[PDB]
Amino acid sequence: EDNKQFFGRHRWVIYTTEMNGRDTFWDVDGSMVPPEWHRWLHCMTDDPPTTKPPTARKYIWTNHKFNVSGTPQQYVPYSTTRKKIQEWVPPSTPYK
C-alpha cells in the first residue's frame, strides 16, 4: 500500500510461490487474489480485511481457487434437469 504512487498504482502486490498445488515463481495471473482482498486491491474500497474482514458464513469457500481453464480441473457443462418422456418399461415373461 502506498500514497505516493498515482491513482491505480497506489496499492499493489507480488504473488506467492505456491497456490493450491501449483508452483508460481515465474507465471502470474490475476485470479489468485481472494475475494476478501479482491475488493481492496481493485480500489473498490478502502477498508482492507485486516481492518474490516468479511462477515463469516458457512457457504463461503475456506480456500479460494484461481482460474482453472486449461488444466485437468476444468469446467464441463451438463443438463441439470431430469429425464422426461421416460421409456415405457417392457415386461419379459416367456411369451403368450
Partner 1 sequence: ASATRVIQLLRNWASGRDLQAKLQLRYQEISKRTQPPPKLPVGPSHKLSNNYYCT
Partner 2 sequence: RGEYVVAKLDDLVNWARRSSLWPMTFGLACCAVEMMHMAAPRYDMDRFGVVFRASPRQSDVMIVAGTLTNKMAPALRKVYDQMPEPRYVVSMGSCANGGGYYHYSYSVVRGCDRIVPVDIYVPGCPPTAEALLYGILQLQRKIKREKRLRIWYRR
Partner 3 sequence: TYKFVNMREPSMDMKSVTDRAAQTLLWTELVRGLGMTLSYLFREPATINYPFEKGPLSPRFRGEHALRRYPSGEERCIACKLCEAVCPAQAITIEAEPRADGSRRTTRYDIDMTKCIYCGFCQEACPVDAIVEGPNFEFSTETHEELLYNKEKLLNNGDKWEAEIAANIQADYLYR
**Positions 3 through 32 that interact with partner 1 (CB under 8 A):** 3-4, 6-7
Exposed/middle/buried for 11, CB within 10 Å: 0-12, 13-18, 19+? middle
19: contact with partner 3 by CB under 8 A: no
Helix, strand, or coil (residue 36): helix
Binding mask 47-86 for partner 3 (x = CB under 8 A): --x----xx-xxxxx--xx-x-xx---xxxxxxxxx----
CB of 54 to partner 3, least distance (A): 3
Whichever of 9 and 52 has its CB closer to partner 2, that residue is 9
Q: Which does 27 bind (CB under 5 to 8 A by kind): partner 3, partner 1, partner 2, none?
A: partner 2
Sequence-separated (6 or more) residues with CB below 8 Å from residue 4:
10
Cell of 31: 485470479
Place of cell 418399461: 89
**Positions 30 through 49 that interact with partner 1 (CB under 8 A):** 43-47
